[PDB]
Amino acid sequence: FTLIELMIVIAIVGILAAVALPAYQDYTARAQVSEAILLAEGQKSAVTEYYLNHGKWPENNTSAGVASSPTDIKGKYVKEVEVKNGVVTATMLSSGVNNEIKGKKLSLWARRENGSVKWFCGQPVTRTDDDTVADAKDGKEIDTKHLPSTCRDNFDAK
Amino acid sequence: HGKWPENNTSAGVASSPTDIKGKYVKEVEVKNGVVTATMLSSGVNNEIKGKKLSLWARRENGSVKWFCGQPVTRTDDDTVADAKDGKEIDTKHLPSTCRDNFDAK
Amino acid sequence: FTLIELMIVIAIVGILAAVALPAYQDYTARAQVSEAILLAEGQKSAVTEYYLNHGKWPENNTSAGVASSPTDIKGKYVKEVEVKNGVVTATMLSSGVNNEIKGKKLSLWARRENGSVKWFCGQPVTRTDDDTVADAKDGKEIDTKHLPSTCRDNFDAK
Amino acid sequence: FTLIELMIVIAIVGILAAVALPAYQDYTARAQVSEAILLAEGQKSAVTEYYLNHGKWPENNTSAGVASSPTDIKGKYVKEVEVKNGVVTATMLSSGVNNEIKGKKLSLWARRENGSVKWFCGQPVTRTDDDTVADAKDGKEIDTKHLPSTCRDNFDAK
Numbered sequence: 074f075t076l077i078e079l080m081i082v083i084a085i086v087g088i089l090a091a092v093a094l095p096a097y098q099d100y101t102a103r104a105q106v107s108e109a110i111l112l113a114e115g116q117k118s119a120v121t122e123y124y125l126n127h128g129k130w131p132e133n134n135t136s137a138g139v140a141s142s143p144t145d146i147k148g149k150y151v152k153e154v155e156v157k158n159g160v161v162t163a164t165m166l167s168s169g170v171n172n173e174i175k176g177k178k179l180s181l182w183a184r185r186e187n188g189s190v191k192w193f194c195g196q197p198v199t200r201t202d203d204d205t206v207a208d209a210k211d212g213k214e215i216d217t218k219h220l221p222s223t224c225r226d227n228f229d230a231k
Numbered sequence: 232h233g234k235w236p237e238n239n240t241s242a243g244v245a246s247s248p249t250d251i252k253g254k255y256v257k258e259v260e261v262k263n264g265v266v267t268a269t270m271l272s273s274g275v276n277n278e279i280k281g282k283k284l285s286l287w288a289r290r291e292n293g294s295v296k297w298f299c300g301q302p303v304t305r306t307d308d309d310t311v312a313d314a315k316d317g318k319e320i321d322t323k324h325l326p327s328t329c330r331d332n333f334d335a336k
Numbered sequence: 337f338t339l340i341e342l343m344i345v346i347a348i349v350g351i352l353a354a355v356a357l358p359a360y361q362d363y364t365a366r367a368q369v370s371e372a373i374l375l376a377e378g379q380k381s382a383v384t385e386y387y388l389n390h391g392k393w394p395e396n397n398t399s400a401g402v403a404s405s406p407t408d409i410k411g412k413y414v415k416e417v418e419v420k421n422g423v424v425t426a427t428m429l430s431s432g433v434n435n436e437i438k439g440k441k442l443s444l445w446a447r448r449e450n451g452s453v454k455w456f457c458g459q460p461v462t463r464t465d466d467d468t469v470a471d472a473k474d475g476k477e478i479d480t481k482h483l484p485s486t487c488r489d490n491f492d493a494k
Numbered sequence: 495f496t497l498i499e500l501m502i503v504i505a506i507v508g509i510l511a512a513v514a515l516p517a518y519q520d521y522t523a524r525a526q527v528s529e530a531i532l533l534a535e536g537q538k539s540a541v542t543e544y545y546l547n548h549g550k551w552p553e554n555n556t557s558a559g560v561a562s563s564p565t566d567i568k569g570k571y572v573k574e575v576e577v578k579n580g581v582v583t584a585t586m587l588s589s590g591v592n593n594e595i596k597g598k599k600l601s602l603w604a605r606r607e608n609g610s611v612k613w614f615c616g617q618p619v620t621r622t623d624d625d626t627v628a629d630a631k632d633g634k635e636i637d638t639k640h641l642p643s644t645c646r647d648n649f650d651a652k
């Protein structure tokens with residue numbers, strides 16, 4: 074006979090949350106990845122200096138002169154950050170993150186410019202030789218959709 | 232947090248179920264993300280008082296989707312089941328938008 | 337004989353407002369707290385620098401090099417922000433806020449990482465020693481329900 | 495002899511619409527103003543930076559580094575947004591709006607905090623000196639009833 078204004082408006086806010094659910098869920102993940110990136114960076118300094126001073130990429134965190142323990146460079150969504158031959162990889166925690174990005178990671182690596190180096194940011198990579206890396210293809214890479222426009226670099230970016 | 236709120240206080244709502252009541256609603260309790268609403272005993276039909284429904288959600292991964300239907304219990308973080316017991320509001324009294332089954336996806 | 341469509345629909349919008357009342361009232365409070373947090377932050381800079389440059393936490397706002405007057409770091413819902421030995425506490429005004437959060441506050445404190453510091457955000461805390469704080473247990477803490485997921489830190493968080 | 499249930503219920507929905515008419519008509523206007531406010535903001539950035547970098551308020555849009563043309567910062571209910579000496583005013587279109595708010599506007603202005611500035615939001619204002627504005631009293635101000643609780647600032651708010 075009457076009461077449908079309360080019933081529909083409680084059910085439009087319910088469906089509004091369902092539509093606002095995936096937007097906040099990738100905005101959210103995309104936000105948790107933007108930090109793995111900040112934790113990865115700032116460690117470029119150590120790595121850059123080590124390379125320019127010696128001409129060899131730092132083998133591990135201790136070589137680069139950073140928390141000798143990967144797990145000591147963690148965060149809220151970051152379970153750690155390891156330096157492996159100049160390549161700095163950031164791992165996403167398992168608690169406090171999206172759902173399709175946890176335990177997932179990215180990498181920052183550089184290239185000899187000769188007198189200086191240039192840095193790249195993208196999906197996990199392994200270093201082959203002092204001037205070549207390759208996709209750490211394995212299945213734990215953070216999905217392209219979660220990576221900034223500034224971190225879409227490919228293993229062979231120059 | 233990636234975990235469903237255990238109770239009202241966890242969800243950050245009137246720590247007391249009875250504090251989320253109404254004219255026909257005797258309360259609303261959050262039990263592991265599942266929100267159940269109980270029908271008062273005074274001021275209602277006759278075959279719906281003391282009866283209730285539930286709203287529960289499901290991880291969409293990055294977001295969640297909500298369901299509305301007859302009382303349900305949460306089993307695991309992504310599974311609930313009919314709170315079969317006899318106090319569910321009869322299908323005839325539920326909107327077309329609240330006919331969801333325990334296994335709706 | 338007739339007119340119940342106008343009577344029920346005016347009474348469903350009335351009860352719709354009553355159901356929409358607590359949702360807007362915690363969404364609202366949760367919004368007024370999210371600012372006390374923004375006012376508290378951005379003062380991390382002063383405090384961080386003071387600590388790293390001297391190895392001692394700033395005793396008060398003036399030491400940290402900020403509005404020497406706590407009341408000078410207020411807002412709409414924020415009655416102020418005081419720095420007490422590196423701990424930055426934000427107080428909720430008494431006018432313009434929820435109802436169960438006014439005159440209530442939170443704290444931001446940091447911890448020596450050795451070469452850098454890490455910040456925490458949560459319910460009011462007091463500093464004991466240069467690397468230890470404790471619950472400013474007293475009854476004026478902003479209730480957990482009003483605090484973001486990013487500001488649920490405990491006095492002993494590391 | 496009979497048919498009054500159809501006659502009354504068609505006439506209760508008719509009067510229900512008449513009662514729901516003013517509610518949707520201020521909820522509506524109040525909604526069209528909330529945007530003039532969003533269009534006004536986000537231009538605070540340009541204005542803030544211009545002031546902090548030079549110590550003088552941007553004279554006009556071009557100075558602030560925004561669509562050199564006021565009319566280029568319009569919307570659905572917004573006919574434009576002009577920056578006049580740091581004061582940003584938003585004008586309500588003439589088509590697509592309430593009825594007692596079209597061609598009407600509001601202003602956002604700031605104040606030197608010394609090292610930073612604080613923003614205000616309210617009824618149209620004019621800038622007198624670098625730290626003083628005044629009511630642009632003229633009759634085209636959006637009525638207090640249509641302004642959010644967050645945009646009730648007076649010319650002398652500090």
Ligand SMILES: *[C@@H]1O[C@H](CO)[C@@H](NC(C)=O)[C@H](O[C@H]2O[C@H](CO)[C@H](O)[C@H](O)[C@H]2O)[C@H]1NC(C)=O
Binds near residue numbers: 129130131135137
């Ligand atoms: C740090 O990175 C260096 C990269 O050249 C690496 N050196 C070489 C030649 O690979 C360092 O390892 C050397 O020093 C450690 C010290 O304990 C050890 O002796 C290794 O045998 C030697 O290669 C890297 N340091 C560490 C601690 O691994």
Ligand SMILES: *[C@@H]1O[C@H](CO)[C@@H](NC(C)=O)[C@H](O[C@H]2O[C@H](CO)[C@H](O)[C@H](O)[C@H]2O)[C@H]1NC(C)=O
Binds near residue numbers: 236237238240242
């Ligand atoms: C709120 O829901 C939480 C869901 O994870 C739940 N935590 C866990 C781990 O189940 C909270 O309970 C925790 O906190 C309370 C606080 O008194 C108590 O210490 C419990 O032992 C602990 O599990 C839920 N909060 C409450 C108040 O129940």
Ligand SMILES: *[C@@H]1O[C@H](CO)[C@@H](NC(C)=O)[C@H](O[C@H]2O[C@H](CO)[C@H](O)[C@H](O)[C@H]2O)[C@H]1NC(C)=O
Binds near residue numbers: 393395396398399400
């Ligand atoms: C600022 O924080 C400092 C933290 O070390 C604190 N110093 C010490 C040793 O606690 C400053 O106080 C010192 O300087 C003021 C200046 O008037 C005064 O002389 C105090 O006696 C002295 O401790 C803090 N500055 C202020 C103004 O309190």
Ligand SMILES: *[C@@H]1O[C@H](CO)[C@@H](NC(C)=O)[C@H](O[C@H]2O[C@H](CO)[C@H](O)[C@H](O)[C@H]2O)[C@H]1NC(C)=O
Binds near residue numbers: 550551554
């Ligand atoms: C932008 O705002 C400035 C605020 O100081 C204003 N400058 C002054 C001194 O008022 C700019 O105007 C100056 O530059 C324009 C450029 O054509 C013109 O030369 C004016 O004479 C000069 O005042 C403002 N820029 C514009 C384009 O108005």
